[PDB]
Paper text:
Tryptophan synthase is a key enzyme in l-tryptophan biosynthesis in plants, fungi and bacteria. The enzyme is composed of two catalytic units, TrpA (α subunit) and TrpB (β subunit), that associate into a functional heterotetrameric αββα hydrolyase complex (TrpAB). The enzyme catalyzes two reactions: the α subunit converts 1-C-(indol-3-yl)glycerol 3-phosphate (IGP) to indole and d-glyceraldehyde 3-phosphate, while the β subunit condenses indole with l-serine to give l-tryptophan, with pyridoxal 5′-phosphate (PLP) functioning as a cofactor. The Streptococcus pneumoniae subunit α (SpTrpA) studied in the present work is a 258-residue protein which in its monomeric form assumes the canonical (β/α)8 TIM-barrel fold with three additional helices.
We have determined the crystal structure of S. pneumoniae TrpA, the α subunit of tryptophan synthase, a key enzyme in tryptophan biosynthesis, and have discovered that it exists in solution and in the crystal as a very unusual dimer formed by swapping the N-terminal H0–S1–H1–S2 portion of the TIM-barrel core. The dimeric fraction of the monomer–dimer mixture was crystallized in the monoclinic space group P21 with ten chains of SpTrpA in the asymmetric unit. The structure of SpTrpA was solved by single-wavelength anomalous X-ray diffraction (SAD) phasing and refined to 2.54 Å resolution. Moreover, many of the previous examples with accidental TIM-barrel involvement in oligomerization are not bona fide 3D domain-swapping cases because the monomeric form does not exist. In the domain-swapping of SpTrpA, the N-terminal structural elements (N)–H0–S1–H1–S2 (with the sequence Mse1–Asp59) are contributed by the complementary subunit. The linker or hinge region comprises the mostly hydrophobic Ile55–Gly64 decapeptide. The hinge-loop region involved in the domain swapping is the only part that adopts a different conformation in the monomeric and domain-swapped forms. Thus, the open interface seems to be stabilized mostly by hydrophobic interactions. The only visible change is in the conformation of the short linker (Ile55–Asp64) connecting the swapped domains. The active site in each TIM barrel is restored and two α chains now contribute residues to each active site in the dimer. Since there is no corresponding ligand in the active-site pocket in our structure, we cannot confirm the exact role of the disordered flexible loop L6 (residues ∼180–190) in ligand binding.
Author numbering:
A (entry chain A): 0 to 179, 186 to 258
B (entry chain B): -2 to 178, 186 to 258
The structure:
């Protein structure tokens, strides 16, 4: 198509028998932060550089909190890789359905289609991708079409009900309710119950369950609970957690 | 509908229908004395307690491979409140005849929205894009959005992994080619650089550590030019002299 101006400009320098010189700078690494970027660029322009590489600093998307953040670091230090996890999961036989929770990047690096196909014969029945926006569900949903893997949607309890209906339309597996300042104190119990009524599949409460009291409260207004930090921490530190789980599983009505 | 209903929905509905609460523990895969080899043990432990399902976390691994100087520069930048959104806005402000090449890992791009990012830079000095951790097989996530634009997607080509293998990357290259890798008898790099140089239809630049004029001249003998990263970032930060080095480098004639 239309030739790109960067190719043209570099070809011209080469054609003139001059060496191409491209400095790299980190955007925002300046006394004035991003307000220093123009100054740096013009400084390099004045010296007649061919082009300038402008780096964007990398921030991770992990928002799970310290207990789980540390568990991830321990896991990586044991040499855990996505590929090795998939292979290990093929090994494991269980009647319990497994739900994979991952951020998008590891999935993307592995290959979404590959990941789904490689788990076809496993105990994996669900997939949660916390940083995948609803508008970009097409990155995963097509590959789950013929499979036994449900894409679980994360639904914010504080958003309007029409928005929640949109998120959960065509949802499979279950609905993961999340609740994240403001002079307005939201009644979480009310919102949870409202979501519960509206949904055609099970609604689980996925925040703030650390005690039997928490567990009973949320079971009154939903189908159940997801418990993360407490279990991860207990397993790591060797605290007994059997009693808590036994009691939780035995919740009736 | 016409498709088979998912087993997870059925299993959870059955627990609910029995009037029992659903209970789902989360575990981090690999967080065990035995690492991944402990996963089965943990799952069976939870199965024995009659949990409804198990959430199995995948650890997130950092993609940054830039080295200490640039790693530190990133942390400084973040501590100044730098965001992708603010960078884009700042770039709309900047007028320059020099073409700018954005280097980013995929995740920040993904978070921003690839299409948004490209459209938001449409009228700016950005003419190139480098995404070190974008696998060639998944170039469809970016390439389509660059189709009608003036932004070239620059490929990283490894000199060690053999040029013919990376034929697809090189043939479908725009902007320039970023090559990555008398003494030490690893003169395989010189040979590979020269081979890549002949085969390429656009300029080939060296992205090995250039820290001296000697480094610069060596690579210019077998390529069209160099990219200089750590040396410049460190010098700007530490107030080391850099103007002379750049002046000399820009002026170099073979």
């Amino acid at each position: 198509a239309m030739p790109k101006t960067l190719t043209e400009k570099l070809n011209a320098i080469k054609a003139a028998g001059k060496g191409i010189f491209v400095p790299y700078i980190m955007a925002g690494d300046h006394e004035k932060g991003l307000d220093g970027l123009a100054e740096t660029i013009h400084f390099l322009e004045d010296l007649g550089v061919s082009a300038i590489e402008v780096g964007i600093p990398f921030s991770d998307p992990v928002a799970d909190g310290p207990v789980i953040e540390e568990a991830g670091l321990r896991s990586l230090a044991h040499g855990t890789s996505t590929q090795a996890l998939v292979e290990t999961l093929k090994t494991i036989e269980t009647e319990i359905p497994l739900v994979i929770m991952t951020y998008f990047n590891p999935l993307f690096q592995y290959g979404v289609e590959n990941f789904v196909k490689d788990l076809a014969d496993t105990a994996v029945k669900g997939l949660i991708i916390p940083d995948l926006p609803h508008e970009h569900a097409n990155f995963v949903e097509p590959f789950l079409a013929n499979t036994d893997i449900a894409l679980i949607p994360l639904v914010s309890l504080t958003t309007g009900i029409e928005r929640q209906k949109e998120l959960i339309e065509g949802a499979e597996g279950f609905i993961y309710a999340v609740a994240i300042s403001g002079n307005y104190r939201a009644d979480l119990d009310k919102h949870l119950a409202q979501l519960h009524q509206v949904a055609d599949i099970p609604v689980l409460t996925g925040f703030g369950v650390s005690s039997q009291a928490d567990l009973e409260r949320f079971n009154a207004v939903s189908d159940g609970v997801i418990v993360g930090s407490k279990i991860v921490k207990a397993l790591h530190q060797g605290e007994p957690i059997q009693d808590f789980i036994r009691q939780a599983v035995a919740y009736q009505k």
